[PDB]
């Protein structure tokens with residue numbers, strides 16, 4: 001009950017090392033080596049060979065620990081995050097869909113059905129990197145879908161969309177612990193409704209393709225939801241659940257996710273290209289979506305299996 005200890009708990013940092021479970025290279029010896037590299041108070045395994053917490057000695061800047069740990073692990077596929085230990089477990093998740101919760105870009109997959117995958121995918125890549133603004137890029141790409149029959153959506157969904165590893169476990173585990181989870185996308189409601197329910201999200205919010213009753217018109221419902229719409233949705237969710245954006249973890253891979261990534265108390269650039277990852281305070285380049293559970297301090301024993 002010491003106030004001296006209690007204040008120390010607030011300025012207390014912890015580093016977390018995280019591997020992909022499919023390339024689980026965080027060996028016990030490596031974790032000890034890393035913890036010695038930062039004069040750690042301790043070393044706590046969240047998942048054998050996959051993730052460990054390394055409490056940092058008080059007074060060490062987070063930037064120092066990050067450099068030290070990345071040096072010790074250089075050349076190993078192990079991610080590094082540093083944060084305050086208090087309030088690392090969040091009660092809101094907000095997650096992008098395309099190339100984040102799913103392996104594909106829904107717009108590029110639909111473009112294949114128009115014989116224009118490569119053309120559209122090149123635009124998608126520049127939009128994801130920040131070289132073109134999202135809304136005009138979305139309009140340009142969707143215009144090339146004009147005339148596709150509505151049956152093509154379920155075809156794409158059923159046959160070409162796959163869930164990113166760790167996604168259901170991430171969503172279901174935070175829900176087990178009382179968190180509210182939302183799938184937000186610059187993509188399309190016809191995809192996010194199905195994906196959200198496969199994974200287990202509480203809600204979804206995305207753009208909407210316009211149709212004439214049988215075929216796509218090649219346009220999107222006005223107004224188009226982009227970077228600010230993701231920020232506004234995080235604000236809306238937090239107010240509605242009686243919290244603030246500091247109580248949320250946000251994750252995405254693209255330039256238009258950086259608003260919600262930067263507003264959230266924990267913002268994660270997941271497998272992002274360098275220009276996007278440079279603008280997030282946390283990056284996961286190797287782990288899968290279970291990395292976000294380890295970020296929050298969950299042990300594998302806490303997971304919904």
Ligand SMILES: [Cl-]
Pocket residue numbers: 175176
């Ligand atoms: Cl639940």
Ligand SMILES: [Cl-]
Pocket residue numbers: 188189190191207208209
């Ligand atoms: Cl739609």
Ligand SMILES: [Mg+2]
Pocket residue numbers: 096097098099100252253254
């Ligand atoms: Mg994305």
